[PDB]
């Protein structure tokens, strides 16, 4: 051990990757949310 290791479960792994700014909720978007259509 004694190295950089993410947690075992995913719930706190998400807060860990949000702490290191690897991924965030502002990066979740598809063509729908980007081009802004509502008939889908």
């Amino acid at each position: 051990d004694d190295d950089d290791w993410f947690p075992l479960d995913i719930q706190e792994a998400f807060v860990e990757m949000r702490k290191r700014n690897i991924f965030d909720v502002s990066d979740m978007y598809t063509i729908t949310d980007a081009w802004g259509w509502t008939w889908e």
Binding site: D3, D4, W5, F6, L8, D9, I10, A13, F14, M17, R20, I22, F23, M28, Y29, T30, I31
Partner: protein, 185 residues
């Protein structure tokens, strides 16, 4: 030296560390359970990529510091990224865009997932020193160095058009190498 050779050309992900194998086999299962939307595949791929890169860099730097030599991390990262820059599509989803067995880039796969709605499933594959070099955009030099038999056969069968954007390609050709004084623009 054998440690460096076996951590660079990964025979299996559990050979370098069983913790990494356990973490990956937990990540993929728990990210198929929850977040079934392509965002789940995306976040799982990103997490696996980050963990694999960090672990590989740490192991290489530890095996280098144990002997007394000092090497900067950028040289290691340049190779580590090329080791784990490609993703592998699973064998259960087939469409007119991609085949079940393919090795596509990570950024291309993520952008296609953000673009296309068709079910696209991909899992991060850790290539090796030899395996990653056998799958390149050129067949003259970077592919025809080890086999020289099938890398030419498949290229002639597909009719591959190779753009001379490399160094050894132009070395074998004989023209000016696009590095340094040859790099125009």
């Amino acid at each position: 030296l054998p440690k460096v050779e076996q951590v660079l050309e990964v025979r299996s992900v559990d050979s370098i560390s069983m913790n990494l194998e356990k973490r990956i086999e937990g990540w993929n299962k728990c990210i198929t359970r929850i977040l079934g939307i392509p965002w789940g595949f995306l976040i799982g791929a990103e997490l696996t990529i980050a963990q694999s890169r960090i672990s590989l860099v740490n192991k290489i730097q530890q095996v280098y510091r144990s002997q007394g030599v000092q090497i900067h991390n950028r040289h290691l990262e340049i190779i580590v990224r090329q080791i784990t820059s490609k993703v592998l599509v699973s064998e259960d989803g087939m469409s007119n865009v991609f085949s079940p067995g393919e090795l596509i880039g990570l950024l291309r796969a993520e952008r296609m997932g953000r673009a296309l709605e068709e079910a696209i499933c991909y899992r991060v594959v850790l290539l090796g020193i030899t395996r990653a070099s056998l799958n390149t955009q050129s067949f003259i030099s970077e592919a025809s160095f080890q086999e020289t038999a099938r890398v030419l056969a498949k290229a002639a069968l597909r009719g591959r058009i190779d753009w001379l954007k490399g160094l050894k390609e132009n070395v074998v050709l004989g023209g000016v190498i696009p590095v340094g004084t040859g790099f125009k623009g």
